[PDB]
């Protein structure tokens, strides 16, 4: 019954805000959005997924020295434990070349036993480099 599909808001340049009012994004049967998190409406098994795409282009030799760490991760906040817990994490290290633009994509999804009230959120290392579009940066879940 419950399902949600959200896209990264392309008008926010420095943060990653999820929204459901445009393109093919949606919420149905109880899923909802508070503090940039999806609130699980009922206990059960859910498939949770997310994708991010990053890009860049080192303009100076200083930028070509050290690598870039890119990571995206879906965390859970349940009343069962006082801390945020990672459910899925994807990581990549990028070594920028002088003037050559780089492009990378990361995707992940799995099934979990969630409890009504739990909150699902994402954390990203590399926000300034996201290619924000509805087909590249999204997050969602659906009950099995």
């Amino acid at each position: 019954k419950p399902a949600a599909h959200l896209i990264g808001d392309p008008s926010k340049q420095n943060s990653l805000l999820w929204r459901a009012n445009t393109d093919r994004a949606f919420l149905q049967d109880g899923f909802s959005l508070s503090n940039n998190s999806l609130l699980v409406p009922t206990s059960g098994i859910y498939f949770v997924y997310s994708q991010v795409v990053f890009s860049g282009k080192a303009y100076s030799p200083k930028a070509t020295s050290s690598p870039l760490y890119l990571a995206h991760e879906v965390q859970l906040f349940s009343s069962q434990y006082p801390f945020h817990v990672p459910l899925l994490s994807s990581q990549k290290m990028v070594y920028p070349g002088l003037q050559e633009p780089w492009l990378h994509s990361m995707y992940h999804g799995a099934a979990f036993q969630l409890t009504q009230g739990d909150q699902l959120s994402t954390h990203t290392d590399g926000i300034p480099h996201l290619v924000l579009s509805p087909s590249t940066v999204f997050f969602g879940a659906f009950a099995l």
């Binding site: 896209i7 392309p10 008008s11 009012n21 445009t22 393109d23 093919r24 994004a25 890009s55 860049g56 282009k57 633009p101 780089w102 492009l103 290619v131 924000l132 579009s133 509805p134």
Partner: protein, 139 residues
């Protein structure tokens, strides 16, 4: 049925008026002869056509890593237009992705062909120089 109208989901034969550019289908028209409920896309959204979309499409950001710059802003019916600063040409990687490159100046040469929208300047080198892929290098 009539092109400019579409079939009502829960009742074949009640061909509602489609929503025109700048708006989206908020609610299917009630009965034959009744207006379809279309609404104006919020800022940041757009629809450039006849549609019965439930949401508006997001406006495109230009690809900064590709050196693109936004020529026209996005409006409720025309999506963002990206390009390059003149003095730069475009190189298409795919039918939608292009990168902006600076036009060659033809130092130590003469402009044979001026820079185009999708082509770099062609130079002719001065005697004593080699044209090494768009630059003149001394012998």
């Amino acid at each position: 049925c009539p092109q400019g109208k579409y079939i009502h989901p829960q009742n074949n034969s009640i061909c509602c008026t489609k929503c025109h550019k700048g708006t989206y289908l908020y609610n299917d028209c009630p009965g034959p002869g009744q207006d379809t409920d279309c609404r104006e896309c919020e800022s940041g959204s757009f629809t450039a056509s006849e549609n019965h979309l439930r949401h508006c499409l997001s406006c495109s950001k230009c690809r900064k890593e590709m050196g693109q710059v936004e020529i026209s802003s996005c409006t409720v019916d025309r999506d963002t237009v990206c390009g390059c600063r003149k003095n730069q040409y475009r190189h298409y990687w795919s039918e939608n992705l292009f990168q902006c490159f600076n036009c060659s100046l033809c130092l130590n040469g003469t402009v044979h062909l001026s820079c185009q929208e999708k082509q770099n300047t062609v130079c002719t080198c001065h005697a004593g120089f080699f044209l090494r892929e768009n630059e003149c290098v001394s012998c």
